[PDB]
Amino acid sequence: VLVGEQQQCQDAKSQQKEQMLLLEKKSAAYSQVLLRCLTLLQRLLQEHRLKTQ
Amino acid sequence: NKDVDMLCDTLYQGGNQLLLSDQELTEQFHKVESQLNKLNHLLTDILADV
């Protein structure tokens, strides 16, 4: 019973690292998507609307 | 994300289709063209009569 208790106790602490890395990498992926959106929107405003139009 | 949001809001201006041209300026061009067409129709009628 206490071996099972210790194993289930240590499982969450060993688990949490990979979700930390997962949220970190998806957080960086969000930054990449936002950078691409910023580039496309500045292309739409400056090149397509501000100067040419 | 906020930058993307008001950039999208500024470029769309409430329309699903993109608005590169100034919309009220665009309809000003359209009404100038339509009134010019009406004046041209009257002028061509007068030319035909002459």
CSV table of C-alpha atoms in Angstrom, one decimal:
chain,number,residue,atom,x,y,z
A,1,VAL,CA,0.0,0.0,0.0
A,2,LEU,CA,2.8,2.5,0.9
A,3,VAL,CA,4.8,1.5,-2.2
A,4,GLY,CA,1.7,2.3,-4.3
A,5,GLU,CA,1.3,5.6,-2.4
A,6,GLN,CA,4.9,6.6,-3.0
A,7,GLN,CA,4.7,5.6,-6.7
A,8,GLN,CA,1.5,7.6,-7.2
A,9,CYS,CA,3.0,10.5,-5.3
A,10,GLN,CA,6.2,10.6,-7.4
A,11,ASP,CA,4.3,10.1,-10.7
A,12,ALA,CA,2.8,13.6,-10.8
A,13,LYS,CA,6.2,15.2,-10.0
A,14,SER,CA,7.9,13.2,-12.7
A,15,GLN,CA,4.9,14.0,-15.0
A,16,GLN,CA,4.8,17.8,-14.7
A,17,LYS,CA,8.1,18.4,-16.6
A,18,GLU,CA,6.7,17.3,-20.0
A,19,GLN,CA,3.6,19.4,-19.7
A,20,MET,CA,5.8,22.4,-18.7
A,21,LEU,CA,7.9,21.8,-21.9
A,22,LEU,CA,4.6,21.3,-23.8
A,23,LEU,CA,3.1,24.6,-22.7
A,24,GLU,CA,6.5,26.3,-23.3
A,25,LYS,CA,6.8,25.1,-26.9
A,26,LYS,CA,3.2,25.9,-27.7
A,27,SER,CA,3.8,29.3,-26.2
A,28,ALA,CA,6.7,29.8,-28.6
A,29,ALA,CA,4.6,28.4,-31.4
A,30,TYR,CA,2.0,31.1,-30.6
A,31,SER,CA,4.7,33.7,-30.9
A,32,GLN,CA,5.7,32.4,-34.3
A,33,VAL,CA,2.0,32.4,-35.5
A,34,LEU,CA,1.6,36.0,-34.1
A,35,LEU,CA,4.8,37.1,-35.9
A,36,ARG,CA,3.5,35.6,-39.2
A,37,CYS,CA,0.1,37.4,-38.6
A,38,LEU,CA,2.0,40.7,-37.9
A,39,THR,CA,3.9,40.4,-41.1
A,40,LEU,CA,0.8,39.6,-43.2
A,41,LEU,CA,-1.2,42.4,-41.6
A,42,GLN,CA,1.6,45.0,-42.2
A,43,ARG,CA,1.8,43.8,-45.8
A,44,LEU,CA,-2.0,44.3,-46.0
A,45,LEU,CA,-1.9,47.7,-44.5
A,46,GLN,CA,1.3,49.3,-45.8
A,47,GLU,CA,1.8,47.6,-49.2
A,48,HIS,CA,-1.8,46.9,-50.2
A,49,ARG,CA,-3.7,49.9,-48.6
A,50,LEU,CA,-1.4,52.7,-47.5
A,51,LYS,CA,0.9,53.1,-50.4
A,52,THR,CA,-0.6,51.4,-53.5
A,53,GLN,CA,-4.3,52.1,-52.8
B,1,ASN,CA,-2.3,39.3,-30.1
B,2,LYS,CA,-3.7,42.8,-29.4
B,3,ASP,CA,-1.5,44.1,-32.3
B,4,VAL,CA,-3.0,41.5,-34.6
B,5,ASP,CA,-6.5,42.3,-33.3
B,6,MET,CA,-6.6,46.0,-34.0
B,7,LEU,CA,-4.7,45.5,-37.2
B,8,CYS,CA,-7.4,43.2,-38.4
B,9,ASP,CA,-10.1,45.5,-37.1
B,10,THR,CA,-8.5,48.5,-38.9
B,11,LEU,CA,-8.2,46.7,-42.2
B,12,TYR,CA,-11.6,45.0,-42.2
B,13,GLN,CA,-13.6,48.0,-40.8
B,14,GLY,CA,-16.6,45.9,-40.0
B,15,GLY,CA,-16.8,44.1,-43.4
B,16,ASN,CA,-16.0,40.5,-44.0
B,17,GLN,CA,-14.5,41.4,-47.4
B,18,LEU,CA,-11.2,43.4,-47.2
B,19,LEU,CA,-11.4,47.1,-47.6
B,20,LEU,CA,-8.2,48.4,-49.2
B,21,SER,CA,-10.0,51.5,-50.7
B,22,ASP,CA,-11.6,54.1,-48.4
B,23,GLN,CA,-15.2,52.9,-48.4
B,24,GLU,CA,-17.0,56.3,-48.3
B,25,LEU,CA,-14.5,57.6,-50.8
B,26,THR,CA,-15.3,54.6,-52.9
B,27,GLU,CA,-19.0,55.2,-52.9
B,28,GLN,CA,-18.3,58.9,-53.6
B,29,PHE,CA,-16.5,57.7,-56.7
B,30,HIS,CA,-19.5,55.5,-57.5
B,31,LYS,CA,-22.0,58.3,-57.1
B,32,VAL,CA,-19.8,60.7,-59.1
B,33,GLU,CA,-19.7,58.1,-61.9
B,34,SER,CA,-23.4,57.5,-61.8
B,35,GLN,CA,-24.3,61.2,-61.9
B,36,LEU,CA,-21.8,61.7,-64.7
B,37,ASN,CA,-23.5,58.8,-66.6
B,38,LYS,CA,-26.9,60.6,-66.1
B,39,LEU,CA,-25.4,63.9,-67.3
B,40,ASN,CA,-23.8,62.1,-70.3
B,41,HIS,CA,-27.2,60.5,-71.2
B,42,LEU,CA,-28.8,63.9,-71.1
B,43,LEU,CA,-26.0,65.3,-73.2
B,44,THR,CA,-26.1,62.5,-75.8
B,45,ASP,CA,-29.9,63.0,-76.0
B,46,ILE,CA,-29.3,66.7,-76.7
B,47,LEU,CA,-26.6,65.7,-79.3
B,48,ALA,CA,-29.0,63.4,-81.0
B,49,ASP,CA,-31.6,66.1,-81.1
B,50,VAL,CA,-29.1,68.7,-82.5
